[PDB]
Design a protein around this ligand. Structure first.
Ligand SMILES: *[C@@H]1O[C@H](CO)[C@@H](OC2O[C@H](CO)[C@@H](O)[C@H](O)[C@H]2NC(C)=O)[C@H](O)[C@H]1NC(C)=O
Ligand SMILES: *[C@@H]1O[C@H](CO)[C@@H](O[C@@H]2O[C@H](CO)[C@@H](O)[C@H](O)[C@H]2NC(C)=O)[C@H](O)[C@H]1NC(C)=O
Ligand SMILES: *[C@@H]1O[C@H](CO)[C@@H](O)[C@H](O)[C@H]1NC(C)=O
Ligand SMILES: *[C@@H]1O[C@H](CO)[C@@H](O)[C@H](O)[C@H]1NC(C)=O
Ligand SMILES: *[C@@H]1O[C@H](CO)[C@@H](O)[C@H](O)[C@H]1NC(C)=O
Ligand SMILES: *[C@@H]1O[C@H](CO)[C@@H](O)[C@H](O)[C@H]1NC(C)=O
Ligand SMILES: *[C@@H]1O[C@H](CO)[C@@H](O)[C@H](O)[C@H]1NC(C)=O
Ligand SMILES: *[C@@H]1O[C@H](CO)[C@@H](O)[C@H](O)[C@H]1NC(C)=O
Ligand SMILES: *[C@@H]1O[C@H](CO)[C@@H](O)[C@H](O)[C@H]1NC(C)=O
Ligand SMILES: *[C@@H]1O[C@H](CO)[C@@H](O)[C@H](O)[C@H]1NC(C)=O
Ligand SMILES: *[C@@H]1O[C@H](CO)[C@@H](O)[C@H](O)[C@H]1NC(C)=O
Ligand SMILES: *[C@H]1O[C@H](CO)[C@@H](O)[C@H](O)[C@H]1NC(C)=O
Lengths: 325, 324, 328
């Protein structure tokens, strides 16, 4: 059996660990850099404001980040805000019977405005603590449904990705050389037909991830666009190609978390003709796209090959001793 | 027979529990999400009581992972494209039209120099420059900080992570957690260790620093999240380890641009159609969420490899020590 | 010749793989954090707008990102935009003979504005589909040359980089301790004279990368500022130093790609005195600087050393068999 185990370990190292595990290569992680450009426009027949356009280029993307990017899909717009005092929103913690309940400063922190000791009426029927803040306060209301920027589904993002492996002084780009420029003029990614088209539709991105753009885009979320560069360096540089994946990253489950979906506040400031400041507060919901790039590669190397082969010999010594037992 | 019992206790006992060398390694793919909550009041000198809603007014701008909380500032207003005197400086000062060179003397004092020489005041005179005017006065930042209420702010930090190799992923919000809990919990090493909502002050504090001394001139806080999991263990044992470091140097010497700050502006189309802007030198603390980690389950490839060398190693151990 | 191969593998492991490959160390990747601050100002004698200043601090850098940063170098400014209906731009797809060609909503998506069914004249000689949108449209024209913010070449960016190796509880900063503060007051990086000056001039950055700031800055691009921390931790902590590299990242070749160079749109919003909104649309071209920090380090360790030595012994066993076959 001594000649049998010896033929087993030789088929175990060369056959198993050197093609299946490919242990004869040195590893190297990817040094990445990405670039996005979103194209589209969206209409909205607001209740009172009437038809309105949002050019996803300028109006839709706060702000214009490096790798990742954020597409506005839904919103609650508070206007004509000015530095002033006013009534908090009706709430067990905010409600007051008189000047005694309102404490200056402390009752402030809670309702997004600083409380002055004064107690005022939120309306005729009810009364609550006065707060100085950006006024009028933001109404407490649910986001519109369907989403205003529902046209977002049909947007499209061009994703350029240059990568390099420092160790192997090798680099490549997600736009393969065998590609027409007129092709990228109107192509759009799809696993089936056009797999090399770096322009992805937003909906397709969310879809592919087993989700639904229209249900998401109401309260927001974050989509992970994973690009994987797993190349065999010893193979032709032509075989090196990006593998695109798509995940929803945040939790949809209302329980067992907080800040469901994804959203943030931002503002537009306007010097009124009176010289006084006013701002428009915007609670924007949307989908944030995180472009996550990673990978590994390796050519042949004598250092790792000899070191694995060496242990394969010592391992055949034990194996023949395991055959004796 | 004694050395053979030593190497067996050396590999299985030492390198396979202490070094845990029977596992395959994998680095983390991370993704984070922050939301800062708070508000702050300022009784400016002249401007009087004023509110800054850390949500909208306090965070320029709203970045991905990391985020930046405005804590102090020097506000220059009513800026317009125009000419005016540079700030008094050995390089900028002039005796007459001869000292002011057009364009060149520009680069230095944050405005372009027209050949003209003008008085910065009655007693002194310096090169005229076109620029955003009036210039930003040269003054120290307020102390205490205006947005000193910042200490008491709180940041929710969500962190989803995945290990590609082991097709495994977890989130910093553990499943054994009420939603009402996260409604008002606040992190603390002692009582609530699983509360992902950290107070800013606590963050700076924990790092052995002081929010009020920092927030005056600014700095950058590293919020390190470490995911070191044993994948062969139950997926339930996989948990984030939070650390806190100040990253920038507080020492005035041996560096430049102490603390952390930047300029930004607010533009306003005047009714005359002419442009004016408000220049703001914002100081603050920038929070860098740095996520990293490693994990590994059992694997025959690495185990046999290491055991193999352990045998060859007992050959040199017994042959070389017998020679000694 | 067996005593010969045994002296060969010994000189192969200790001599080759343990000094040249340094395989006796454990590896560790760098934890990084960077901070940039760009300083400069730039003038522009626009056609009609006359002399104008852009303080790279505030006016030049949309927006103020974490690691990477973006310097505005060229632009096409569309002003007095307001929500309104107006003619699309002349195009085979947009052109219309009458009300019949213009479909409400659908002909919208294409020309950056939503089409109302009505067909209007883009001018006296031609007519095209009316669209509601931010109006007037952005004229279709090529970016100015030379670039308006051509003064950008002479800007300078301070790049502060703190790094740490978690495993070895070791950390260091790209500003070495042997450095005066007055030095960094006016130093400027150069491979030759001042190699330890973390304040790089933009042009020098692009130059070093074998490119030209003035040709780039017209249509934009992205520069990779690579910082490499390759330290030997068993060596004195003083030998640990950053190596700076520079490499244009985007493709200049017009063919075999799209979105050549680098640019984006952004806007300035103004509440008109009438209460109505107006905005200034800006197609900004520029160079985006990506600070890419990476590295590896390692001290001595018995685990990896014994491992490699162990295989060197088994390797000497087969090496005896290699000279056997050579003997025939
Ligand atoms: C440029 O020219 C090619 C013309 O064939 C085109 O190739 C294909 O594109 C379609 C996309 O739906 C595939 O259905 C089709 O199989 C491909 N055709 C063949 C057989 O070549 C390329 O896509 C264009 N650019 C390149 C070079 O990829
Ligand atoms: C999850 O939910 C419950 C309900 O809020 C928490 O219960 C509180 O928990 C503690 C610890 O057992 C009690 O001492 C308190 O009396 C409870 N508070 C009140 C007033 O209801 C429970 O702690 C939470 N579990 C976790 C995630 O630790
Ligand atoms: C948008 O809103 C109005 C008011 O309901 C409607 O009359 C008009 O048709 C709508 N426009 C489009 C293009 O849908
Ligand atoms: C997106 O695409 C299709 C095809 O144009 C269109 O019919 C549908 O209305 C679009 N969805 C939205 C909500 O814009
Ligand atoms: C802030 O400043 C003024 C002026 O001294 C004072 O009258 C007012 O009470 C202060 N506001 C608060 C609520 O702290
Ligand atoms: C702003 O600009 C003009 C510049 O001449 C000056 O007259 C005016 O005083 C300034 N306005 C304010 C409110 O300070
Ligand atoms: C935040 O909290 C405590 C609450 O008692 C208070 O003492 C402190 O003044 C607050 N800090 C600041 C700086 O407002
Ligand atoms: C800029 O533009 C004008 C108009 O051509 C010229 O008169 C003026 O000298 C220029 N300014 C500078 C400082 O170069
Ligand atoms: C800007 O917008 C309006 C509305 O279309 C137009 O009537 C007006 O002429 C424009 N103003 C200027 C300054 O050209
Ligand atoms: C920048 O620097 C050089 C050297 O001072 C100067 O000759 C050149 O004019 C400058 N470039 C621009 C665009 O001002
Ligand atoms: C600091 O000081 C001395 C002053 O003579 C000078 O030689 C040296 O170059 C400076 N060191 C650095 C790091 O610039
Ligand atoms: C917004 O709010 C206040 C409410 O009293 C009103 O005085 C002001 O005119 C409004 N601003 C405009 C001009 O829309």
């Amino acid at each position: 059996l001594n000649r049998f185990t010896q033929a087993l370990v030789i088929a175990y190292v060369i056959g198993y660990v050197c093609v299946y595990n490919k242990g004869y290569q040195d590893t190297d992680t990817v040094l990445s850099s990405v670039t996005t450009k979103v194209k589209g426009i969206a209409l909205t027949n607001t209740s009172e404001l009437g038809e309105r356009i949002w050019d996803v280029a300028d109006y839709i993307i706060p702000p214009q980040e490096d790798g990742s990017f954020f597409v506005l899909t839904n919103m609650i717009i508070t206007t004509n805000q000015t530095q002033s005092k006013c009534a908090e929103n009706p709430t067990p913690a905010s409600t007051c019977t008189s000047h005694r309940d309102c404490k200056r400063g402390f009752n402030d922190a809670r309702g997004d405005g600083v409380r002055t000791g004064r107690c005022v009426s939120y309306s005729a029927s009810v009364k609550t603590c006065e707060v100085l803040s950006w006024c009028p306060l933001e109404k407490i209301v649910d986001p519109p449904n369907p989403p205003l920027l529902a046209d977002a589904e049909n947007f499209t993002v061009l994703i350029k990705n240059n990568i390099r492996y420092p160790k192997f002084n090798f680099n490549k780009r997600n736009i393969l050389p065998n590609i027409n420029s007129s092709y990228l003029t109107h192509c759009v990614f799809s696993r089936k037909t056009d797999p090399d088209c770096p322009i992805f539709r937003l909906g397709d991105i969310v879809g592919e991830a087993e989700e639904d753009f229209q249900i998401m885009a109401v309260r927001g979320g974050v989509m992970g666009v994973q690009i994987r560069w797993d190349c065999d360096l010893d193979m032709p540089q032509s075989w090196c190609v990006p593998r695109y994946t798509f995940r929803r990253l945040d939790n949809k489950d209302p329980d067992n978390n907080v800040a469901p979906g994804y959203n943030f506040r931002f503002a537009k400031y306007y010097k009124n003709s009176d010289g006084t400041e006013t701002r428009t507060l915007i609670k924007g919901y949307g989908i944030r796209f995180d472009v996550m790039v990673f990978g590994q590669a390796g050519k042949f190397n004598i250092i790792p090959t000899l070191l694995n082969i060496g242990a394969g010999l010592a391992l055949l010594g034990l194996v023949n001793v395991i055959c004796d037992w």
